[PDB]
Amino acid sequence: MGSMERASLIQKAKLAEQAERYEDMAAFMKGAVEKGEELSCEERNLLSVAYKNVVGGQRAAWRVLSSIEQKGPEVREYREKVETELQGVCDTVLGLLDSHLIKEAGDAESRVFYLKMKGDYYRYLAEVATGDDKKRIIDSARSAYQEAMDISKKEMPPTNPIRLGLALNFSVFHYEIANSPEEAISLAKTTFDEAMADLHTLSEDSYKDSTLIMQLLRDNLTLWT
């Protein structure tokens, strides 16, 4: 995408989302990041939407194949093929975050957003990991989420939607990856309750966003308890 203007890449990412062409969307956003400039709030959301959809589809396919495999070499080979492609996308996202989105992000909102992404893509790698590096992959996710949590608690109100989504995802990490369901439940409960107590400060539109994510926290708590 090196020959396309930054603004054209952003425009085409928005078109690709409307057309449900998420692989294209991700390629346009990778090209935009590689222009070397920081991303605005809207642009960070385009980047996240694109890769979350791509990897989300790979994860769903890997789960179908892994279930068939658990129940000739073809099933294992094909699961391995999908797994390698998933790992490749996660590595690409982590590479964008490391070169150089995180290091240039100084405002709390941008830095937390990117560290939450970093935790998420290490979490997706952990979902498929089995080898000598599995513990290290899990700890890489934990470390990214933890740094994001520490910044969010110092710099953002308890209803901030990035802070809430981070806590949601870190709670999923605890439950599904780290084998720490009590930590997951405690984080989700404390996050929900501290957000509830700050809703009175919000406008109607901020209220809607915070309560939307609070409902996701509650949905998980209902599933886990």
């Binding site: 996240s48 979350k52 998420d120 995802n169 439950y175 939307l212 996701l216 949905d219 998980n220 886990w224």
Partner: peptide, 9 residues
């Protein structure tokens, strides 16, 4: 369970 979606929907 569920993680954050890419868009509000």
């Amino acid at each position: 369970a569920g993680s954050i979606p890419g868009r509000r929907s």
